[model samples]
Target: DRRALRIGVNGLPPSLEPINGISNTGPRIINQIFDALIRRDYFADGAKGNNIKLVPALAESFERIDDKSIRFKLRQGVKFHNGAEMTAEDVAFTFSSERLWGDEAIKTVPNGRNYSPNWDEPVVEDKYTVVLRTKTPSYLIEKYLGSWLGPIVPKEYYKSLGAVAFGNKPIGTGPYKFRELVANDHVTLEANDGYWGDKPTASTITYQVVAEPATRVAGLISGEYDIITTLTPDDMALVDGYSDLETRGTLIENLHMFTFNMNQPIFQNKTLRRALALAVNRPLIVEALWKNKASIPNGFNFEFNLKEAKRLVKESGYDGTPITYHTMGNYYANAVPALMMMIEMWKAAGITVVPKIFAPGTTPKDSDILIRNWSNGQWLTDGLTTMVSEFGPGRQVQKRWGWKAPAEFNNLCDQVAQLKDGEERSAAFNRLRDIFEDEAPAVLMYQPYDVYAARKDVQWSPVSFETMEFRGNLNFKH
Candidate 1:
């Protein structure tokens, strides 16, 4: 019998291409199937607070040559799943213009460009060394490299398959190699025997798509599944009650908020937006849904001021127009309940809001508000991941949600991007947050905790980031 680990997930992301599919399940799955040039030292013991450490992965060592350039020395003998040796050429090609960098890039995947705004094509110095160039003196280079922004791919193999085919069947220098992919059913992976790092404990890993919480829990209880993702608050006690089952949770660097489409006529009024922001009780929803496990970020604070909200609503000339809000239909934990509570609060504040359950694989259009989540996985202390990547020019929030920031906000973003000093950057970040709170482009509801259920013998814990490190120092007890 083969040693295997089965993980039941809410759903499967469409593609395995690192950039094209960096949403929800994308980062979790990609973490197993790819390695970046630099990676976060998640296992470091002395690490706490915002002190995130960057260590070498595909690149054995890296150095900052100047303000605008960094050099990486590829770890020799690293082999792709296709039996090709990883080289400087592969590293350079991974960030090529065709895949993610320039204007000629495939417009379908805008996220690649979003995370790599100031980055330029890499220069191959030799078979083992590559110099990563930036368009400007950018402070986000190290963090972006360590994050999921760039995953080294085989240039020849990818060219032969093209974007669409390569995304479905990909090759990387990770511990697990893609074995089989059955759309909407499951994805199976086999351990790479030639892995350069620690050997993968599991012989094989299977990610099965289980859409319902109850169904996933049922499978785990029956010992048919080893782990399940996105378990609800109600299942925590139930899972812990079982002698053979347990629950693991952590406060991840993610924010669930409602984004306002600034271009929309209804939300164009700052008074109306501020009233909408002040009407909702975030702590109430946090307690009811997350059982107080989630935390409210200190940067954003708005009390439940019904009187002030009503006065603002009346003063803003709002005509009781029902604002359209879009949600992905229970994709988030207690999403339905949270929306219901928020709508009721708005009603009490003299504003009518409507919610639209968008179908899977469909983009939210013609909506004034959207229930979305953003993460600062790149650098927990920095706002680049959210403020720039999500809301900057040509980013998703701007391109898809049609929420453009004011000229001042955009200018602050530009200034923050060029800074690296912690004190100065934090000051700039505060300024940006101040503008965000005042403009009400988005309301920071809370910082959520990602929870999961697993068998007692599953020796693993969830991290504050999106990616699940199945290939890390984890094992299943016999």
Candidate 2:
């Protein structure tokens, strides 16, 4: 019999390539199936405030030649799942993928770091050496290369499979091999016997998709499953009573918010958007949803002033056009009650809203308003992610959420990105916050409780960033 570790997840990703996939699950699992050039020295970030550093992984070392250029020295003996040796070309091709960085970046996957306008084509210096040249002096090149943003893919094999086919039977230099994928059912991974780094502890790891939170908890409590994620606030209350189960919750770099289709005619009116924001009783929503473990933020960055919110709704002539609130149902921990509260508040404010639940990692094109939550982890400390990745045209929120950052906001992000954390960045970020607060480009909701629950003896957990790997960190303790 094959010994294995079983993880019951809320859902799966659309694709599994490092740079591809719409859901967090794919990228989370992608960390197990591949290795980045380098990785964070530790997963928990900003504990010491300024205590952040990039550590080596598949690439033995990283050298920052300057702000515009960085060099990587790939490890020589690393082996892919299929036994092909990994090289610098694999590293270069992974970042320089035509779909991610081409003239037209792939539309499905929006968070690809290669698409950063500040980046230039990565030049492969030799078999085990590659140099990344950026168009500007960027602050987080080393961190980005070390994180999930950089998964070295085998060049020839990726081309052979191509597109979603590549995601199906992907090969990587990490400790786990993709054994099988049954769409929405489950993904099975076998340990790579020829793995180059510290090998995975389990012989097989199965990501069984038990989308329902209660069902996941039930499975883990009864010994059918060993791990799960986003065990809702309600489920968290049940674990202590169960004999065989326990929970671990970490404070991740996460925020839960919504984006309005600023392009939509109905939202074009600040008063309507203002009307929507004003209608919410944020404190109630936070208490009910996160059990007071979360935060309810204001129109821009920080609290609920009910009097101001009510005044805005009263002034704006709301059209009552069934405002669509799109989200991923209950897969995300706070999604359920958060959006429901919004729906509840809007109707009370004399506005109509329709709640639409999309597939896991899927966002609808027809949505007037889309709500999502994500954490930048180390990226936030790097001084560029929230401003540049979340703001600006063709970036994360702006590109997909159908909003455009004003020229002033765009210039501010660019200028601030060039500086380290200090008075300059503080001024720029604060001004950026002011722009978002005044503009209300999206319904900035709340900072999320980056919650996850697993069995007591699972003996392993994901990084604050959310990826779970079965390296030596994972083991079953009986």
Candidate 3:
């Protein structure tokens, strides 16, 4: 008899192509069908697995020769679901493609965002050994290689099928093989019997687009489904009430920010920006909005000085200008309520705000205040680099939103990626964070939890968002 696991999630992923389309559910599901060379330590708890530890996945073992160079030895018996044996060439092809396609051929497939055209190609040391090179010496080699970009596809198989055709039915050496995609309706997968790791306990995994939160939570409680990937704080409370359902949670390093439109002249005044920053009552907002489920951002303080915020705005010697706060309804449903609170808080500081909620036709570009956010991934560098790196003219929150980092800040963000994680690396991070606090590039909001749940009948406890793939480790409680 075959066992199956079904989950109701937020939305349908536009594409299954790893680099091409990036979002919450697709990548987690993709992790099921694809394997990184090395990933964070899975069994470790709290912060250990998020970064600082590496475990072998597709590659049996790895070695870092220097900042720019690294070597890995592949498992001998690994084979793509197509029956093609994986080799060093596949590893080299993957990283090199990140540069070649990342820069050029990428759009030919891509979204999570732009592939920095900067990655240097990797070299094949032998049939079983591969060496990866970075244009800039990055001590975070394992983080990048083991990140979302870490997926390896058989070179010959990929080349046989062009970009458009590959995602329809791509083959890999992961534990599951894609069976069918029903657009917004659902997706199904069948376990790869020959998977190199432990055989998946469930033979079939089904992902469905369940956009409504209440419907998803109720479905799990009533046993209409076996699992649900993400839930909100309120829904979590409801799930906790049911003995037949359980919610799993972990604090992930995803920043929820309000990027000020530095492009606007009003924000150009440093005093005004700092005043606006001081005006925010993050503690009250986070407590009320998230139920304190998320950590208060260390970048800013828990304290709000409304008097100071009011004084600075007055000192800027400005006429009253209405501020627009833009956000999307479907993605960040929680944003509008929180933003409304912000508008009220700013009002206390004598700043008049006109809240703007954005949609497909409406643009957030012209807004005085932007409601947006970015995350630091499992890798320490992933979150930090995305959150603080070079802004303006390149893809990333700060720059794309026209947040300007001082030369020292930009240089540090760039160089921090090159250095390994340590005290020196930490100091650089703290300094960059301090810069954000002072510059007010973005309202550094709290990092929230990626909450999930499953039917009590489904026996599993997810450690983090990264651990929710169709792993063989899960099974039924009954």
* Each prediction's whole-model lDDT (CA): 0.76, 0.69, 0.68
Give the clashing residue pairs of candidate 1, or none: none
User: In model 1, which regions exceed 4 Å deviation?
Assistant: 46-51, 300-303, 358-380, 422-427
Q: Give Cα distance to truth, residue 238, candidate 1, Å.
A: 2.2
Q: How far does residue 468 in candidate 1 sit from its true spot (Å)?
A: 0.3
Local error of candidate 3 at residue 115 (angstroms): 6.8
Per-residue alpha-carbon lDDT of candidate 2 for residues 106-185, written as tens digits (9 for 90 to 100): 54345665334467778989999999877888766776676566778888898787756787788998788899999888
lDDT of 1 at 368: 34
In order of appearance, the predictions have TM-scores of 0.91, 0.88, 0.84
Model 2, which residues run further than 4 Å from truth? 43-53, 97-99, 104-117, 295-302, 358-380
Q: List the residue pairs that clash in candidate 2.
A: 38-146, 278-309
Quote the positional error of residue 411 for candidate 1 in Å. Answer: 1.5
What digit string (tens of lDDT, one per residue) describes model 1 on residues 1-478?
Answer: 4478899887677888887767667777787788999877766775432236777889889888988889999899899998899999988887877777777665655566777747777899999999988888865677777777768888999878876688899898888899998987888988888898888888888889877678888999988788898765766977766988888887776666776776677666578888998899998998888999888876532167889899999999989767767776656656667889999999999988877776545655555343343333333346554567776666766676666577887887777777776898778778888777777767777777778898878787677766687645567787
Candidate 2's displacement at residue 51, Å, is 8.3
Clashes of 3: 6
Backbone clashes for every candidate come to 0, 2, 6
